[PDB]
C-alpha cells in the first residue's frame, strides 16, 4: 500500500483516536465537548443545545480545566491554574459561578492552592481542602465553616491522602465522601509523623543554581505505615460562632491489634456508612456498617452485622477488598467475592446474615459491578466465548438469577468485543463504549428496552484515514502450558509470510493481577515496529496474571519474581518453536513492573533473548512502597519472607547480563519506583564486569511524561531495538 | 613475535612505573619503603639501616596507612583507618610509637576520626584537629591542651579547611602553620554559616534501604562565601588550667572593605610571619609582614612592610599569588612574578623597599622556586630548548646573577628532558626525578659540587617488558597560528606511516593554565588507543594554557569558552592539513574542564568531530565554584559578566548537537562538578530532540576512580570511540 505506521505517526498522533467522553448531570441528561463549546444532550429525545459559549479561556482570562456544576443546576465551579502533584493529586484556584444571574461571586472565594473541591450530591454546598484541612461553605458565598485544624504539611493530612494511600489504595487524592442528601461529611485523616522520607534531587530550570532536595513520606517495605483514623460531620448543624464536632468512628478491634489500613467508604444510606479495614498482611479484611443515632449524635457499628473477608492462599481482592454496592433501602448489597473454585463473582449479602449467595458463576470472573437498580443488576465480564480477555456488559434479573441478559455481546461480534458503560443516574441510559478489536465505537442506550438510541461516535475518519495504511494485525490466542491455558497476543507485521522469520519483541508487565493478552485496540509504539520495522510485538500472560480465577492469579503469593519471570521465557521459548520467529533475534522489554521482569529474564541465564530494555524498573522490593510490596510478599522480617526479599533482586543476577545487550532508563524524579532502584541495578552491573547501557531523564516522573522526554524516550529505545535486530 | 600493549594492560596495571619514593629527615639522610620495611639511606656513602621492619605491627592490629617520625626522632605517628573525604581531607586514627622504648603510647592518646595531624618542625609537639577543633600535645604521653571551642561540623573551622578553601586555595585540607622553632602555632579560621548548601544522594550498599542525602557547604559563583580569620597561639605558654590565648593578625583594611580570601601563609623567621590575602575579585592581591614583640605579644604588621601584587590584563597568580621564600634572617625573600612582558620570574623583594629587583627574564617561565642556601637559588624552568613543557633544574649564584647554570639539562638528553627535584634539609643533597619522554630516573646528587653520587631507580625492568610489545611513539612540536608557538603532542601508533589515513582522537583539557603538550612518559589509555586499535590520539595547548607567558594565558580572561574550544578545532583543521589523518574520523573527549570544552566543540557546528565524550563536564560557570570560575570569570552579576555567565553554556548550544554523535558521563556523587550539571545538559538535549548516549556512575565521585568503576569507564568509552571509527 505504499505507507506505514512510522514512529513519527506515533509521537505526533496524525491517526487520532476519537473518544465520546461525557459527564452526566442528571437522570437523563449530560455534557459534552463539542470543539470548545460545552453543549447539554437531552438523552431520550436527541436534542441538545450550547450551554457555554465563551469556550476554554474567557470568564477571566484563565485557560480552564475542569466545569463541575453543581447537582441542583444553580453554580459552577471554574478550576484554574492546575498544578500536578503525584497520579492523582495537584492543587489549583477556583472560581465559583452564579449560574442563574451569570456572575462571578467575589465574596470569600477559595483560596488559590486548593487540594480538592467537591460538591455535596444535592444542592450547592463546598467542601474543600487546603493546607491539610477541611473547609464547608454552606452557600458558595458565604464564609467558609472551618472543621479541622490539626493540618500540617507533609505530617497530617485532613480530608487528602499522603502518598501511598493515593497510589495504592484509594487511587485517588480525595478522602471526602458526602452523604447523599449533603447532610453528613465523612472523613479519613492520615498521620505520617513516624514514616522516613525518601529524598531525591530535583534540578529544575537552568536558572535554579543549586538543585532542591524534593522530600516525600514513603512508607517502603516493613518501615513505619501511616496511620488513620475516620469521622464524620454534620453540616445542617455547624454553629455560626463556635467550633465544628467531628465524631470519630474508630476500626474494629480485630484491626486495631496492628497496623491497619481503611481501604472503602461507601455511604449504604443516608444514616448508614460501610467501612472496609484491612491488615497490614492483606489476608484479612472487615466491614463495619455504622449506622447513626440521632438521640447521642454517635455513630455505632454493631459486630453483628461487620462481614469478614478473607483469603487462605493469597491476599483479599485484586488490589484492594472490592466495593458493596448496597440496594436502595440500605439493608442488603452486592460485592464481588472470590468462590470455593477460584473465580470472583457477584454474591448478595443481607445485613444482619452470615455469608452470601452466589448470583454468578462458572469458569470466568465478573470485573465490576456498574449499576444497581429496583430489578436489574448490571454487571461486566469476560464471560464471552471463554475469552479472560473480553469484557461484555450483562444484567441479572434480580426475581430470577438465572435470567442473565448480554446487552453488548451481539451488537457487532466481531467488531467489539471489549466494553465499559457509564450509566446516567437511577441508570436509565447507558453509554456503551467499545475498545476493540475494532475501532472504538461509542452508543448510547435506553435500560427500559436495551434498545440503542444513537451512535455517538463510530470512528469513520480513524478508518478512512488507516485504509492508506499497511496496517498490522493482533493475533490472539492461548497455549496449553500444562492442562491451563495461558493467554498471549501478537502484533504481527502487514504482509506476514509463516515461512520467513522475524525477529520477536516481548511487551512485558506481568504482573499481580496483570493483562496484556486482550482484545482492546491500539495505536502505539508496537503498531510502529510491526508496520515500519517488520518485527512481531508479542506478549504473554502467565502465572500471577489476572481475570482468570485465583489457581493462576495467587501462583505469585510470597513469590514476585518466580513465575511471572519463567513463563515469559516460556513463552518467547514457545513463539520461536513457531517457524516464523527468528531464535538469534529475541528482545524482551518492559516498563516498571515489566521493567523489573525483564532484568530477571536478562539475568536469569536462559540463553533465549539477545538483548532487552528495562524502564524505570523495580530492582529489590525492599525499596518499593509497602502497601504494594507487602500485598504479595509479606513482611522483610526474617520470621516472614525476607529470604524471597533477598533472593528476587536484580542486583544478585548481575553476573548473567554480559550473555545479553541491556538498556536501562529511569527518571531522576520518580517519585514512584525511585532512581535508586537503577543505581543499584548500575552499581551491581560495574561491579562484576558487565557492560550495558544507560539513560537516565533529568526531572522525569514515573511516566516519563513530558512532551518532549516522551518523544525522546521512544527514539532512543527503537535505535537500540533496531541495532540489536540487526535492521538499518 | 611481539604482543600489543591492550586495554587489559592498562587496566590490570601490567607494565608498571617504579618511581623512588623518598622523603628527607635530615640533611644527610632518607627514609625509603622496601617491603614494609622501611630503611633510612645515608645520602653521601648510600648505605642503609632497617629502621621499622615489616614484621613489626602485625601485633597493632592494624594495616598502617602511613609513618611520620617526629624532627627529634624520639617518636612516630602510625596513621591507620584511613577514609576518605574530599580531594586531600580524611578522617584517621592514630597511634604514637616510643622509638627510644619499643612501646606504644598508651594513655592521653590522640581521639578516633581526627581530621589533621602534624608535628612541630623541631622537637616533638603534637599540633592536632579533631572535631573542627585544635588541640597542643607538648608531649606524646602528657594530655592535651585545647586552643579552641567554636569548631562546628559544616559551620566553624578551626585549622582545617572548608570544601572550597581545601580545593582552590591550599590543595590542602590542612590549615596549622608552626612556626619554625616550634614556639608559635598559627591558623585560620573559616566561617561557612551562610554558605548555601549543595544536596546530593548516596545510594550505598544495596543493603541501604533509603538513599542518604550528602550536604555540603559549597559557595556556588556569586553565592555568598566563607570568610577567615587568622591567629597565632604561644604553645610554650598553654595554662594547665586555663585556655590559650590566640593572638588574632587582622587583614589589611584594602581586605576588609568587601569580600577577600588568605591564599598564602608562610613562616619567614621565629618572630616573623608573612600572610598574603587576595579580593574576591583576584587582580588584587596583598602581603603583610608581621613581626611579634615580647613587649605585649600582639602581632604587629607594618604598612611600610607591605607588598602589592595586581594584575592589569588577568588575574594574580597562576592559580594562587606565589609563595615566598625567605632568606634565613628574614629581611629579604624571592617570589615567582609576572614580568613586563608578561613572563613569569624570580623577583628578589627587601622588605622595606617597595620595588623588586628581577633575577631572571627571558622568553620563557620560572615555575617554582625549589630551594635557597646563602650562594644558590634552586629553580625548576622550561627554559632548556624553548620547550615549554619540558622541565630542568637550575642554579642562580646570588652574588651574580648572570652565573646560572643547568644542573640537569646534559645528564641524559636524550632519556630526560621533564625534571623536578627534592632537597634535603638545609639542601646539601638533591634527589633529581627525571619524568620523560624516556622511562623514568632518578638519581642522588650532592649540592656541594654538583657531582652524581647514584641511580636510585632507572626502570630496567619495565624495559625489559617492553621490548616485546609494539609500543606508540610520540611526537611533540608545534603549528603557528597569528605568529606564535602553539604546542601539540601526538601519541602514534606503532609502525606508523605518513601514507594511510589514521582516525584522531583529541584528548582535551584546555584550562587555565593548563599544560596537556609535555615530555613526560606515560603508559595509559591513549596507548592502548594507539597501540592495538590504530588511533593517533593528540592534544593541543592553545589559548588560555600556561607556562609561555601571560599573552596566551590571560587571552582566556573573563572569557571561558571562547578562544580554548575554537582553538582546539583549529588544530584538528590543521591536523587534517597534514595528510595522514582520516578527517572523516575525528573525534574529542576530556574530562571536567576538558569535558566542557568536549561539549562546546561538538556543539559548535564545525564539521570537523563525528563524535566526542564529555566526562564529568562543566556545563555552566554558575554551578561550579565560586573560588575556581571568579577567578577568570569575574562575578556572575549584571554589573559585572552575567551576560557572558549566559552565553557560554553546553545547554544553548544543545541544537547543533544533532550533527554529531555523542557520550555525556557523569558520577552521581560528584562533589566538585556536580551531577546536577550533566542534568542540565541532557534536559537540554532532550528538549530540542538529539540522541545521545548515556552513562551514570553511582556513587561514584569525580575521579571514577574504584578498582570496577575505572574498568568500567574506559572499557565503555573504548566502545563508543572504536564504533564511531568503524574499527571491529
Ligand atoms: C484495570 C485496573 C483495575 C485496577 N485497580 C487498581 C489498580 C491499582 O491499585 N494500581 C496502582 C499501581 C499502578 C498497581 N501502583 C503500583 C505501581 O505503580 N507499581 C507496582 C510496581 C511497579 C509499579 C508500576 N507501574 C490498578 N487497576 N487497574
Ligand atoms: C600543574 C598544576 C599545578 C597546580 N596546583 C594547583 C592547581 C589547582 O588548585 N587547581 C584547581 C583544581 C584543584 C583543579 N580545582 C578545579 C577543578 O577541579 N576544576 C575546575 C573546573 C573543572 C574541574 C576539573 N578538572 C592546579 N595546578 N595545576
Ligand atoms: C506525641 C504524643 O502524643 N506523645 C505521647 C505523650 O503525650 C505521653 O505523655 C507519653 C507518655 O505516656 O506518650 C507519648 O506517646
Ligand atoms: C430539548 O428540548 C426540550 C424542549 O422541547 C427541552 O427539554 C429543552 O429545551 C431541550 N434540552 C436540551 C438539553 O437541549
Ligand atoms: C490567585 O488568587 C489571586 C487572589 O489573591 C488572584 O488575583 C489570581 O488570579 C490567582 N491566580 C494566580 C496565578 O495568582
Ligand atoms: C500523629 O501521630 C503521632 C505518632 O506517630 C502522634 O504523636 C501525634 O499526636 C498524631 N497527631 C494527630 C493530630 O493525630
Ligand atoms: C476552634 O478550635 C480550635 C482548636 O481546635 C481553636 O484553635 C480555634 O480558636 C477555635 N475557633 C473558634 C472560632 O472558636
Ligand atoms: C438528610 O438525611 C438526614 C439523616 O436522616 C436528615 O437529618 C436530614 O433532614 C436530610 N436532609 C435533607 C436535605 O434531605
Ligand atoms: C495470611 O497470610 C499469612 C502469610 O502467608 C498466613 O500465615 C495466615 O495464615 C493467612 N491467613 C490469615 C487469616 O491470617
Ligand atoms: C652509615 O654508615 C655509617 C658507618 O658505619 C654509620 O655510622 C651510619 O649510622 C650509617 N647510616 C645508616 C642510615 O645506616
Ligand atoms: C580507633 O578505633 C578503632 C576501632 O574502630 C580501634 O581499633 C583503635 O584502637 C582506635 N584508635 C585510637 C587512636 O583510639
Ligand atoms: C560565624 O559567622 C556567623 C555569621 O554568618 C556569626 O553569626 C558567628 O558569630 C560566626 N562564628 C564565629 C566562630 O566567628
Ligand atoms: C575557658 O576556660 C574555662 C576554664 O577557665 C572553661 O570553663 C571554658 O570551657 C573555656 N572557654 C570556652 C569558651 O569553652
Ligand atoms: C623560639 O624562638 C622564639 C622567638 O624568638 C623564642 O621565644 C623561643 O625561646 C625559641 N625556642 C626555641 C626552642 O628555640
Ligand atoms: C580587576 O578587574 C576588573 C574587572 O575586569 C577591572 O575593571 C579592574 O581594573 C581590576 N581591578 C584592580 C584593583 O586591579
Redesign the interface.
Known sequence: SRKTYTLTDYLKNTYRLKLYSLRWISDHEYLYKQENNILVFNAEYGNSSVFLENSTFDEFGHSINDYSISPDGQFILLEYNYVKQWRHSYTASYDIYDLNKRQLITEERIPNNTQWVTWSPVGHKLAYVWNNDIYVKIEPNLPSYRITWTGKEDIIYNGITDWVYEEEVFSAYSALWWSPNGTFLAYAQFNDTEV??????F?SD?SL???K?VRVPYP?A??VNPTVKFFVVNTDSLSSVTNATSIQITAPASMLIGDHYLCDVTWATQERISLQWLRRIQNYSVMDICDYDESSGRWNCLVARQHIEMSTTGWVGRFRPSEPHFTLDGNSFYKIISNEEGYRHICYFQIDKKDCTFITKGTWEVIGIEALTSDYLYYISNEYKGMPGGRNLYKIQLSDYTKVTCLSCELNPERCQYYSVSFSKEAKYYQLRCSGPGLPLYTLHSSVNDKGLRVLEDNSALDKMLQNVQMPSKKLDFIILNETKFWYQMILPPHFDKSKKYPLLLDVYAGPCSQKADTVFRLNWATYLASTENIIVASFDGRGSGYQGDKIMHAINRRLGTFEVEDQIEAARQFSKMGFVDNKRIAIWGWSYGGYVTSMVLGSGSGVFKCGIAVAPVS?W??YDSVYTERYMGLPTPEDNLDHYRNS?V?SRAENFKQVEYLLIHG?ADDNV???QS??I???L????V?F???????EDHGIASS??H??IY??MS?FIKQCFSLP
Not at 522516613?196 to 534531587?201: H, N, Q, T
Not at 547501557?693 to 526531572?699: R, S
Open positions: 522516613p522520607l525518601i529524598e531525591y534531587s534540578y537552568e543554581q543549586y538543585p532536595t517502603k516493613g518501615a529489590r525492599e525499596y533482586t542486583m531522576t525511585h532512581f535508586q543505581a543499584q548500575s552499581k551491581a560495574v561491579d562484576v564486569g557492560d547501557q544507560a539513560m537516565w531523564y533529568t526531572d518532549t522526554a518523544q525522546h527514539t532512543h535505535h
